[PDB]
């Protein structure tokens, strides 16, 4: 079976403005994912970069992952409607979710 050593550093913080009770966030993960065999003499090192945004109340969402030994990247986005004071009542914006996913190899 395979063994794993994943070092990572997460930086980021809250975004200003809007509902600070559900304050928006941005995050950057950098690290190195190493798989080893049973001997540990076959070794696979992958550089990992992850960028996350989620705005206040998770309205606007972005997840970007870049993997390198060659190369593999993904951008995922999810956009909800702008809120109103009453969560129980229908009619927040256009009541629609917009999502996009892009994957590029090489």
């Amino acid at each position: 079976g395979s063994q794993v050593e994943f070092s990572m550093k997460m930086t980021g913080g809250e975004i200003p403005g809007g509902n600070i009770v559900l304050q928006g966030v941005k995050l950057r993960i950098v690290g190195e994912w190493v798989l080893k065999g049973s001997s540990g003499e076959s070794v696979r090192r992958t550089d990992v970069k992850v960028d996350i945004t989620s705005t206040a109340g998770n309205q606007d969402n972005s997840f970007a992952i870049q993997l390198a030994n060659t190369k593999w990247c993904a951008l995922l986005t999810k956009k909800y409607p702008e809120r109103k004071p009453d969560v129980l009542a229908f009619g927040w914006g256009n009541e629609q979710v917009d999502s996009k996913a892009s994957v590029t190899i090489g």
Binding site: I20, V21, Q23, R83
Partner: protein
Amino acid sequence: SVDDYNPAFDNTHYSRFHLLIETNGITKPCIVSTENVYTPDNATVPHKQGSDYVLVAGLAGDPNRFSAYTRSQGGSKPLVVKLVNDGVTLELTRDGASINGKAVSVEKGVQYPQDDPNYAIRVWKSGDLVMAYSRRTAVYAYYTGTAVDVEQPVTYRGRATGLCGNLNG
């Protein structure tokens, strides 16, 4: 039928985080109107809100750590709420908010201590909606003028007091 929520589907008004913690009993919402307390144990307790504060939630023997109070001032949007989180007092009224006896610009969002990531209170207003959260106690609340939702973490089980009552265990 709250646990007929399906998190496989995107929802336009709700987060996965909120409804998953709620349907799994990690949070214990209590609704207080002017006329009734709707307990997290699924009881409607009639209580006519008056000019004096009544204890709706709080830690047994330690209301400085956490306590929540409701009164009515009469007129339109009549509910007044007091939230105490680690010695820091938030008062909500229809006209806005105050922190330890000083009014604050709650429509632009306010944190006390302003510098402390382990904040006692954050509060924010849009129209008549007020939201509040404490990182120290993990109590969330929101407020309309007509009612308040006070949501305690399940970690308070066996220490809960006030009209909202037991945390289900």
